[PDB]
Amino acid sequence: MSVGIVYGDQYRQLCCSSPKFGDRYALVMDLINAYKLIPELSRVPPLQWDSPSRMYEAVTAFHSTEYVDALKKLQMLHCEEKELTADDELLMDSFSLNYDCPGFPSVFDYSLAAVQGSLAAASALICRHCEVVINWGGGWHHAKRSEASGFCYLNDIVLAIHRLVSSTQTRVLYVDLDLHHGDGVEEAFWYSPRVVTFSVHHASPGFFPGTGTWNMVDNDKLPIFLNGAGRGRFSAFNLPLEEGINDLDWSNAIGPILDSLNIVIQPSYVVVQCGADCLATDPHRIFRLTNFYPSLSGYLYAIKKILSWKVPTLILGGGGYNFPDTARLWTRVTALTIEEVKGKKMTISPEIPEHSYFSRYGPDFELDIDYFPHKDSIQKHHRRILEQLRNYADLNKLIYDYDQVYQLY
Ligand SMILES: CN1CCC2(CC1)c1ccccc1N(Cc1ccc(C(=O)NO)s1)[C@@H]2c1cccc(Cl)c1
Numbered sequence: 001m002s003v004g005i006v007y008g009d010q011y012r013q014l015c016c017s018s019p020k021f022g023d024r025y026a027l028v029m030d031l032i033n034a035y036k037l038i039p040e041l042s043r044v045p046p047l048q049w050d051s052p053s054r055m056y057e058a059v060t061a062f063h064s065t066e067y068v069d070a071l072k073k074l075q076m077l078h079c080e081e082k083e084l085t086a087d088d089e090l091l092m093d094s095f096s097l098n099y100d101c102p103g104f105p106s107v108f109d110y111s112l113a114a115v116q117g118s119l120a121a122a123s124a125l126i127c128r129h130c131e132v133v134i135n136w137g138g139g140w141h142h143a144k145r146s147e148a149s150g151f152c153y154l155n156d157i158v159l160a161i162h163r164l165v166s167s168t169q170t171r172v173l174y175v176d177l178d179l180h181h182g183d184g185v186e187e188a189f190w191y192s193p194r195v196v197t198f199s200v201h202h203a204s205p206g207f208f209p210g211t212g213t214w215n216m217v218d219n220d221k222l223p224i225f226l227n228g229a230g231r232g233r234f235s236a237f238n239l240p241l242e243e244g245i246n247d248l249d250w251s252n253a254i255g256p257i258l259d260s261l262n263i264v265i266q267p268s269y270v271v272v273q274c275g276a277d278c279l280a281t282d283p284h285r286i287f288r289l290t291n292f293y294p295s296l297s298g299y300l301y302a303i304k305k306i307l308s309w310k311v312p313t314l315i316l317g318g319g320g321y322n323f324p325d326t327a328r329l330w331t332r333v334t335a336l337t338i339e340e341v342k343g344k345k346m347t348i349s350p351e352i353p354e355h356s357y358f359s360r361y362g363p364d365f366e367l368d369i370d371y372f373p374h375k376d377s378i379q380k381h382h383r384r385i386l387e388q389l390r391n392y393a394d395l396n397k398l399i400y401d402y403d404q405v406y407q408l409y
């Protein structure tokens, strides 16, 4: 069927207006355009609201009115020469609108743009206009009800998933491939069995945001994983991985888990956060994934497997602090999505085509990232996860082969 992609003139300008992500969104969409992919894609315009009240209702489906009010005020304050008052500094500090989530003149418009894009993408799936929709301006998984976190101001993902589950029993499987734990999405749906969250990430002492690993409590008892609560018990899945993992080991770590979640949950929709900060070339320098398509990119391995399910899917961006390598990865994800969904082979030249941002792709100007890969707790994680999935299934009265599922591992 049809693959949609979110873009527009205003949308691009807003997505390029933040100090942390600068013109990343422009490199991504211009590289997709340089490879002649735009004619294969259905343009999905960002959602717009008939009034301020309708916009406030949509965003406050998740966020608190006082947080939305403070974010709106932070934008007003940064569009003026006047320094903040003592009480304004306190208000903004109370919502963590500082440190990693500072103010800037477009902070509200920028944050809301991601929401507009991901809501339009979910709408395009719900009405069956597209089988898959991509939004490289979204995936801000850390934003919480009343707190900015990890340069995430509004949780476009939580709001898109809310629109999906609220449609016509609808289950959503959320897969978070970002280097960082998908805490804001996991927390939003902590009490729901209808949205199952799965995050693979780095976890280590002092690494942001600290969650998605063993629960640290006062007793000498063996630590265990919190995995949701009430009717949501066992519905939040996490795989924390040590630094240094390559394409093949990360692919082997997640593949059986993805296969099992799909078979047991039978989701109506899949939402994938594809944060590019696991790339070997990300300045975090934690994981050693690639965008290679020959050893297969772990990212391309995961997207190909997800798309093989033929479940309507939303693919989102997220982290990725090496802008040219993020564009390299996300162009290949976009081409792979065209190939799997349209059944139309896409031949991408290994040389970056000439375009405005061509100089940004030095020094080799090739599509492969400039990295040469070289030379379990995971098996333990696999047994724990498999037991969690059996627990989730039993609690939610789902029937499944279980021998078939045990075999995948
Ligand atoms: C405002 N505040 C409320 C409480 C939090 C976060 C936001 C929250 C919000 C919504 C639903 C559940 C939860 N909690 C319970 C958990 C959900 C996910 C957890 C985890 O460790 N997963 O890996 S712990 C969070 C929490 C509680 C205590 C310590 C830590 Cl680190 C995190």
Ligand SMILES: [Cl-]
Pocket (backbone or CB within 6 Å): 007, 008, 009, 012, 029
């Ligand atoms: Cl654009």
Ligand SMILES: [K+]
Pocket (backbone or CB within 6 Å): 007, 029, 030, 033, 038
């Ligand atoms: K474009």
Ligand SMILES: [K+]
Pocket (backbone or CB within 6 Å): 176, 177, 178, 179, 180, 181, 182, 199, 200, 201
């Ligand atoms: K993640």
Ligand SMILES: [K+]
Pocket (backbone or CB within 6 Å): 189, 190, 191, 192, 193, 194, 195, 196, 197, 228, 232, 235, 236
């Ligand atoms: K859940």
Ligand SMILES: [Zn+2]
Pocket (backbone or CB within 6 Å): 178, 179, 180, 275, 277, 318, 319, 320
């Ligand atoms: Zn990240």
